[PDB]
Amino acid sequence: SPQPLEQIKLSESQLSGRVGMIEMDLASGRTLTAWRADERFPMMSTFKVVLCGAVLARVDAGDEQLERKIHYRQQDLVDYSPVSEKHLADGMTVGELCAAAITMSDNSAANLLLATVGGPAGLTAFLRQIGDNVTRLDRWETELNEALPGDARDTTTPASMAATLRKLLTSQRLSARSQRQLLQWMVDDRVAGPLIRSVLPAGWFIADKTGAGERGARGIVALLGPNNKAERIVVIYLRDTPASMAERNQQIAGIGAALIEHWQR
Ligand SMILES: OC[C@H]1O[C@H](O[C@H]2[C@H](O)[C@@H](O)[C@H](OCCCCCCC3CCCCC3)O[C@@H]2CO)[C@H](O)[C@@H](O)[C@@H]1O
Ligand SMILES: *C(=O)[C@@H]1/C=N\C(C(=O)O)=C(\COC(C)=O)CS(=O)(=O)[C@H]1C(=O)OC(C)(C)C
């Protein structure tokens, strides 16, 4: 593999699209690699991690309980509700909804949670409260995936998303139990976690949330490290490429390979 930056560049050349990437030490916030780190990319389903950070903040304040059962109706459901469509009769707890959103990318679960935090405007307000002045959510699932060229709606930057994830996971804004819960949801991702593990060398930790949207949009927010440790946050977004999903996946994996082969920097 090339050095990480050279691999990132190669991925742009091959995809004809923009890549944005940060590699950051989880414990300290040291930025190791940055590419288009201040440029905007659609969050797609990666927003669901920040969403459940906002839910957890409400739990910590005594304004929410992960146990609380939410009952909902079939007419509430949007496209791709693998977990939530199973629970029309019995409902789902707030914690189950976050598990479904983060680990299954259940869109209706995400919208049910978004309602509880004041919708897209409420989530954006929460982001501002934790000092992210850049990331914004404007729409609900599934319109937030539109990825229109030049549209600032529903975007983050690699730098802001990495800093925000670090704040949620480590900064004691959330309680110890809540930090542990958010981490565990990412560890438990079923959409990409097992696939990623199948290609990672033995000894490498992964926790993640992935996303995909229109116009080639694709992304991952992850924790990665050797010695079975979540050493670094890695955030990679792709936009405005006509490439197949398989090719987008393989380019992201190629960037991962470059990081793994050149880890000590
Ligand atoms: O010397 C380092 C390693 O080099 C190879 O490992 C390869 C591995 O066989 C391949 O499957 C992976 O693909 C990359 C898979 C990455 C998966 C996605 C990563 C995510 C995680 C963080 C967010 C962005 C991308 O590359 C590594 C590095 O060459 C050897 O197989 C392995 O025995 C050795 O320990
Ligand atoms: C988040 O990025 C997305 C959310 N849900 C979703 C869907 O709306 O269909 C997913 C579909 O997963 C598949 C391929 O079965 C999860 S996802 O991460 O792939 C994503 C998304 O919208 O994906 C596309 C529909 C754009 C492929």
User: Is 143 among the residues known to form the active site?
Assistant: yes
* Side-chain-side CA neighbours of residue 118 (13 Å): 10
CA-closest candidate to residue 105, choices 86, 124, 79: 79
Number of C-beta neighbours around residue 131 at 10 A: 12
**Structure token digits, residue 196:** 């990623």
Contact predicate 186/26, CB 8 Å: no
- What CATH number is associated with residue 178? 3.40.710.10
Cβ burial of 91 (10 Å; 0-12, 13-18, 19+) is middle
Apex CA 260: angle with CA 258 and CA 263, to 5°? 100
Q: How far, in Å, from the CA of 132 to the mean position of ligand 1?
A: 31
Cis peptide before 155 (omega within 30 of 0): no
Residues 6+ apart with CB under 8 A from 136: 124, 127, 152, 153, 154, 155, 156
**Structure token digits, residue 101:** 């959103």
Report d(CA 143, CA 171) in Å as an integer: 32
Report d(CA 256, CA 260) in Å as an integer: 6
User: Is 45 among the residues known to form the active site?
Assistant: yes
Task: Give residue 185's domain range.
Answer: 1-265
Q: What is the dihedral of CA 177, 167, 133, 65, to 10 degrees?
A: 0
Q: What is the dihedral of CA 102, 183, 129, 111, to 10 degrees?
A: 10
Which ligand places an atom closest to the C-alpha of 245?
Answer: 2
Per DSSP, the chain holds a count of helices (H) and strands (E) of 9, 9
CB 63 near ligand 1, within 6 Å: no
Query: Domains in the chain: how many in total?
Result: 1
Residues 6+ apart with CB under 8 A from 168: 49, 50, 53, 56, 130, 174, 179, 182
CA-closest candidate to residue 219, choices 252, 246, 259, 183: 252
Report d(CA 164, CA 185) in Å as an integer: 16
Closest atom, ligand 1, to C-alpha of 206: 21
Nearest residue CA, atom 11 of ligand 1? Answer: 199
Report d(CA 170, CA 230) in Å as an integer: 12
Report d(CA 186, CA 169) in Å as an integer: 11
CB 22 near ligand 1, within 6 Å: no
Report d(CA 215, CA 31) in Å as an integer: 29
Closest atom, ligand 1, to C-alpha of 234: 23
* Alpha helical stretches, state H, the chain: 4-15, 47-60, 94-104, 107-116, 119-129, 158-170, 176-187, 193-199, 245-261
CB 220 near ligand 1, within 6 Å: yes
CB 88 near ligand 1, within 6 Å: no
Whole-angstrom CA distances from 249 to 3, 5, 121, 161, 236 are 19, 18, 31, 20, 11
CA-closest candidate to residue 209, choices 173, 182, 171, 178: 182
Report d(CA 6, CA 198) in Å as an integer: 25
One-letter amino acid for residue 108 of the chain: S
Residues 6+ apart with CB under 8 A from 202: none
Report d(CA 152, CA 129) in Å as an integer: 20
CA 125 to chain centre: 18
One-letter amino acid for residue 95 of the chain: G
Look-up: residue for tokens 């990412």?
186
- Helix-helix angle 245-261:4-15, to 10 degrees: 170
One-letter amino acid for residue 109 of the chain: A
Q: How far, in Å, from the CA of 211 to the mean position of ligand 2?
A: 7
Read off the DSSP letter of residue 201. P
